Paper text:
Gastric infection by [name] depends on the expression of a nickel-dependent urease in the cytoplasm of the bacteria. The ure gene cluster is comprises seven genes, two of which code for a nickel-dependent urease ([name] and [name]) that hydrolyzes [name] into NH3 and CO2, one for a pH-gated [name] channel (ureI) that delivers host gastric [name] to urease in the bacterial cytoplasm, and four for cytoplasmic accessory proteins involved in nickel processing. Ureases (EC 3.5.1.5) are amidohydrolases found in bacteria, algae, plants and fungi with an active site composed of a carbamylated lysine (KCX)14 coordinating a bi-nickel center. The overall single-particle cryo-EM structures of [name] urease reveal a 1.1 MDa dodecameric complex of 12 [name] and 12 [name] subunits in a tetrahedral arrangement, in agreement with the previously published crystal structures.
The map at 2.5 Å resolution depicts urease with BME bound in the active site (U-BME) whereas the map at 2.0 Å details the binding of an inhibitor 2-{[1-(3,5-dimethylphenyl)-1H-imidazol-2-yl]sulfanyl}-N-hydroxyacetamide (U-SHA). We determined urease IC50 values under identical conditions for BME and SHA as 13.5 mM and 19.6 μM, respectively. SHA coordinates with the bi-nickel center through its hydroxamic acid hydroxyl O18 with distances of 1.98 and 3.10 Å. In addition, SHA O18 accepts a 3.06 Å hydrogen bond from His221 Nε2. Further away from the hydroxamic acid moiety, van der Waals interactions occur between the imidazole and phenyl rings of the inhibitor and flap region residues, especially conserved residues Cys321 and His322 whose side chains are within 3.5 Å of SHA. The difference in flap region positioning appears to be due to the bulky SHA imidazole and phenyl rings that would sterically clash with the side chains of Cys321 and His322 at the tip of the flap in the BME complex, with both residues fully conserved for the 260 GenBank deposited [name] urease sequences. This steric hindrance results in a displacement of the flap residues away from the active site, with residues [name] B321-324 having RMSD values close to 2.0 Å. Interestingly, despite the binding of a bulky inhibitor the conformation of the active site residues and the coordination between the active site residues and the bi-Ni center is not disturbed when compared to U-BME and to the previously published U-NAT and U-AHA crystal structures.
Residue numbers in the entry:
A (entry chain A), B (entry chain M): 1 to 238
C (entry chain N): 1 to 569
D (entry chain R): 96 to 380
E (entry chain H): 476 to 569
F (entry chain H): 191 to 285
Amino acid sequence: MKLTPKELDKLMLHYAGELARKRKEKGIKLNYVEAVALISAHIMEEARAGKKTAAELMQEGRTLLKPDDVMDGVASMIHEVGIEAMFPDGTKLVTVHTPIEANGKLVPGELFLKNEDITINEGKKAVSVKVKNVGDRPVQIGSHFHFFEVNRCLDFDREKTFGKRLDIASGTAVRFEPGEEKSVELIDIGGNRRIFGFNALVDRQADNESKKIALHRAKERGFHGTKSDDNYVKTIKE
Amino acid sequence: MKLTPKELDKLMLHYAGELARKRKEKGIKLNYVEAVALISAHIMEEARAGKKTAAELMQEGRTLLKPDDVMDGVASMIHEVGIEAMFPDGTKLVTVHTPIEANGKLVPGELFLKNEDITINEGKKAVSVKVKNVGDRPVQIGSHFHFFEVNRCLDFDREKTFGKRLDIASGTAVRFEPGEEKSVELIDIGGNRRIFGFNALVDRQADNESKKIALHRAKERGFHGTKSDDNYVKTIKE
Amino acid sequence: MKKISRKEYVSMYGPTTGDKVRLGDTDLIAEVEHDYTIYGEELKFGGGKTLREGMSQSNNPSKEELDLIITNALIVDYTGIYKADIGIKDGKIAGIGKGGNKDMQDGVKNNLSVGPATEALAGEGLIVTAGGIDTHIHFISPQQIPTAFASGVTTMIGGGTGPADGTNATTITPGRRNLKWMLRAAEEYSMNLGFLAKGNTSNDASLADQIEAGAIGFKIHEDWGTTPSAINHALDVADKYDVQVAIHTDTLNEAGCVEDTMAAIAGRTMHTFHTEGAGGGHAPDIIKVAGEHNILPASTNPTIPFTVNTEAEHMDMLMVCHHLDKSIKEDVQFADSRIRPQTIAAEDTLHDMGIFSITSSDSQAMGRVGEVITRTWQTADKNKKEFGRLKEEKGDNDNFRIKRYLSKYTINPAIAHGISEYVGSVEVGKVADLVLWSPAFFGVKPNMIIKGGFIALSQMGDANASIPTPQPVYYREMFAHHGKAKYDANITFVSQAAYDKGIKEELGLERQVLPVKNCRNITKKDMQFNDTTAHIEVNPETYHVFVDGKEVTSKPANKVSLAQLFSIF
Amino acid sequence: IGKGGNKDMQDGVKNNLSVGPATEALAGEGLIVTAGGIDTHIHFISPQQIPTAFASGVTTMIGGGTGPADGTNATTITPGRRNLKWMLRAAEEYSMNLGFLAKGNTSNDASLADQIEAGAIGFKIHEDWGTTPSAINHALDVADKYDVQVAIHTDTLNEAGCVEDTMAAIAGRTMHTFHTEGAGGGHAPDIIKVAGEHNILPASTNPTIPFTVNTEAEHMDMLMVCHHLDKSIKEDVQFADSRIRPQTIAAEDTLHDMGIFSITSSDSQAMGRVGEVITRTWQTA
Amino acid sequence: REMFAHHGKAKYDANITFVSQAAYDKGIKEELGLERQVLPVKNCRNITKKDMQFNDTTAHIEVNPETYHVFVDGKEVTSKPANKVSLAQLFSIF
Amino acid sequence: MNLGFLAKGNTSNDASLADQIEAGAIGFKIHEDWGTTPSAINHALDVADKYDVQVAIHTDTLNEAGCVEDTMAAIAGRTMHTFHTEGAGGGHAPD
Ligand SMILES: Cc1cc(C)cc(-n2ccnc2SCC(=O)NO)c1
Ligand SMILES: Cc1cc(C)cc(-n2ccnc2SCC(=O)NO)c1
Ligand code: NI
Ligand code: NI
Ligand code: NI
Ligand code: NI
Ligand code: NI
């Protein structure tokens, strides 16, 4: 036969699903493990038969178990079931989203939250800047990026954004389509305000002395909207 | 239960065969692994039942799968299936030879050969020698054995075979039944022609000086058909 | 002299010069180019055969006597397709040629002498190739390693620390202490291994200390922040330490576009992972860097070959991992700029032209670690069915295409990571990491693996049986997998600087430890059979791909070879 | 071995059977204790043989090989110093006493002696590497000097001589004979006559014991597969009918009951079953 | 004239003394204090006339006991003396 | 110059032959002025077989103990390097 370890693991999964199906035929309400095994085994057999696509199987997996077929709490625990199966065109991943609707009140690991909002970046006053994407490709900017050093095809008054970042929730982002124009909110970077990296326009302590060097560097490298005056005076370390 | 590792491996094989049988009942054409598993599992169950011999099961294994039951190419890949099973008289090996006939054109790993013959031992001129087995037991001689030193119950003119071997395909052999007489073709041994072992009749460089010593040694040990003259003169190293 | 018919010669010794063989269930036909044997003096083992004392086993052998000989093998390599015997001594390939006993046979050289210390392995009717090399491993779970080993891969290069969230995204083992953890864990396994460090920093001292701690290179990944500053600093340190750099570029175009990344690279050597861009990279035009001279471009296996289920599967994978919602117009706009069936369709044809040069897995991180070799040969078969036989072929065979696709997972990644003096091909003086295939099962299921000159894995029947053949047959560990023998059969690759400071003695490693070299002076022209450079353009609106002005695409397939005929799941 | 206990409170307790605070107890009432079995005909084809033999009650395995190579599939031989080093370092994995046999099929005395110095406990002489009288003589000469054992699979084809020529080459020296009945190999048809001799230690392998109604057909079909014989050729049929011989197979059980055969063994995965030596011994009894 | 590899301690690194394998294994280089490279000879006993490159002819040779004529496979073999050779007086003052 | 030295092969004492090889020689020379007899030829070839070294010979010009076929019988098929084989420098007269 020349079986691989993958084939042995899938054989075990198939017979777990068969046990779940026999217990369902005897009238027993299925638990969490039994329901997951039953859905996975059904998808693998349908893909072996070769008459259905993966997208059709993603919808067919949602009709296998009624809400009355499982114990109370099972449906809230199963958010998705994934399984890889070999089609005539090879191995594909099939994910079944929310296969069972709930019918009882038991939610394991339930969260009970207060209703007060959370205030982020307290004590930081924001300013508003209009930004336009004049390039031909989309741009997306994260919450803690140094906004002065973003993609040179974005056009905005870059002098007002030195030492600042977006005032949004940490880990979220703002998207600019080609030709799109909108306003954003910016707040001061905290901590020691030592800015290293990002386009290597600063690489030192952020202050008013380092802003002139950064503006001159940004103009020489063609960043849009940068205004630094002519007859610039160099320092000993630039 | 006190299960052994053999029992666990055979349990896995049985349920692989059961999966293959369920897929055959659903109308799915079996692949290579499924066909091998189905034949093996059927043989094991029939041997457990205890009403058939191993030789009958060797023929019964050839009727399980029709040519239309398997995918194209399966029948050319399965040359034999072997399985050990426990009968009432103990564990026996059952081998099923060519269980499925082919019906399509796909041959995986197919060879496309030229039609010209291969000439072996080019530039070696052969001689012909008549050989008779005057013993009571059969004798079989391989292609690269030093033919001068074969079994002493073979009778032939041994002087003409010094330094020679059979002119047949490498790895094949010639058989002599008791009382049988036939002719063989012999060619010169190549390389450095240093002959060590085989009956310890030479154990040195093969030449005309070493032939006299070998003939005297063969006559003293009773090899048939050896003719060395009387009043032999010894050397300092024999 | 005697005449022997061709059919019975081939049944005894395998195919010879001019004969042809089909590879697997594909439509690829290989032809034997040359034979080293002397007709009538073939080596055969068994009762009454030639490999016996005083006949082909010498009673006066040379002082370079072999430890193991593989008889009548059909070698398939980037150097050629030919029949020979293969000799192994002291963990190395000692000779490729005729072999036997000079006392009784004509053309036997000293390095192919068979003696009393020699073991025999019958290769008649079988194919020998070098072991595969996978350069895009996420070290998420140790169970990936036996899965890759059974598919025919004998070297794994990547990074990680186990199932942590950083490893689930990136091929990175960060810092000296984590490198010590992974190097000491590596003593368990039957696989050659090498580890990549974190390249996403602008601190030169932090970059240099990881190389001295044992890493063979850097990975730069957008989840740790791929900025032009970090690219510049990492390339500067890698120039000084002679190690390779790999990159996953900025998908969001946050700090710049693709030309800004190329300006940061500034003509220096770079290995690009998943260059088509479905796995990540500058939307939508990362694929244009595959025409450049200093780029070594690679593709990962879940996008090859292009099938009718590919786009929907990748879209639903993208929706799960990023937690997107179809009711938001920005998540839909993000997803439609990511997947792009136009570039995915172009990728297969670019592989057939020799513009892409390396295939890899991206294991458990949008990719399948046991399917690199199989999906490579599926892509070759689909391209032969669509575009016909290549114009570079000489004769009625597919030998040029076979060499081009075989180079993608054997010799080209070995050159790219500076280990081609040790592994990657069947040549005299290299490490004996070899794979034996039956031609009916070529590309999907091998017969046995030889690791460091000793057998490490094979198909094997039940242990209580009277022969090794009866059922159940599956892949089992052999004697080179066990005890202290596995220390002598496996290699851990490190940098030259870590090797010179004595990393083997400092960490107490018992495996062989060898340095990588010649990583910085190679370009696209050093890739065997895949060395094409061109000018590549991507339309910013329709995402069509042009190569020197001509549009490049392919059609999806509804059926592939080497899939459902061979596997129960 | 005796009574055991505490001399302060009980009568017949000797010093070597004293039970104290450092002692652990194991209850053997109603149970049988024997020594572990010793199997001397192991082909080291796969490491998975070792746990199978261990669970059946075997605690020492003696044989040769390098894994699933074609030489090991036929013969119990670990050839040469480097391959002996490989197997000795791999042996640190397992729960089994182990010992390895070297290649005896050569006429070079220096090659024979270097294998013994590299760690082998003896030689195997096998017809697939060529069992000639010269090789038998040289191997016995070296084994006399190094105090190790020799095992032999003799020439089935009678190519260089018959059974009396092999006995003349042995020349009265001590020899262990594998599968002496001859179904596993040996001088056709009369290798079984050496089991009456003084200097021979004769052994049988387990697939021929006990003699059952399925034995002959199973062994015949095993012979047809391994030698790739065809029933349409009169020489393959004549070869097969001189090999199997139900007469000697039937005689083997009675010779075991008379004390003429003295050792049982497996011939593991090479026409024999490594987990069934003890069971087939008691079935024959 | 002698060049730089002929002199000093450089001549130890540029020259080889050949010995037997047995003397090499017993440490003859350290015992006698030799500074040259020391290497063993090997494969001396398993070679014949057939191992000589481009000069590997074997034949049956007979010499007449009275006239001293030489025959190779029955055919007489001889040559004529020369009164002048190349590469001699054109190139050397003595 | 690369250099290698030959030892005395003209003896019938095996221990004396073996000690010269262990002292550093790469082979033996057998020369008629120290006495080239069939006994010495036989003993020297026996030791050289065990130590893997070459033998060279200047044969008996005077035919004192035997002729050329007796020397070849003493050699007994083993490998031998013959110096000045034409015979003007020495060797069995005249053949
Ligand atoms: C298309 C895809 C698939 C998967 C499994 C993950 C991602 N995914 C999620 C977050 N970031 C990424 S891209 C990194 C990668 O998959 N390899 O480097 C995207
Ligand atoms: C009766 C038999 C059974 C098997 C499995 C193999 C052979 N067979 C094939 C070639 N040579 C032999 S005999 C060597 C042996 O089985 N043990 O030493 C014979
Ligand atoms: Ni990536
Ligand atoms: Ni990745
Ligand atoms: Ni045997
Ligand atoms: Ni055996
Ligand atoms: Ni002289």
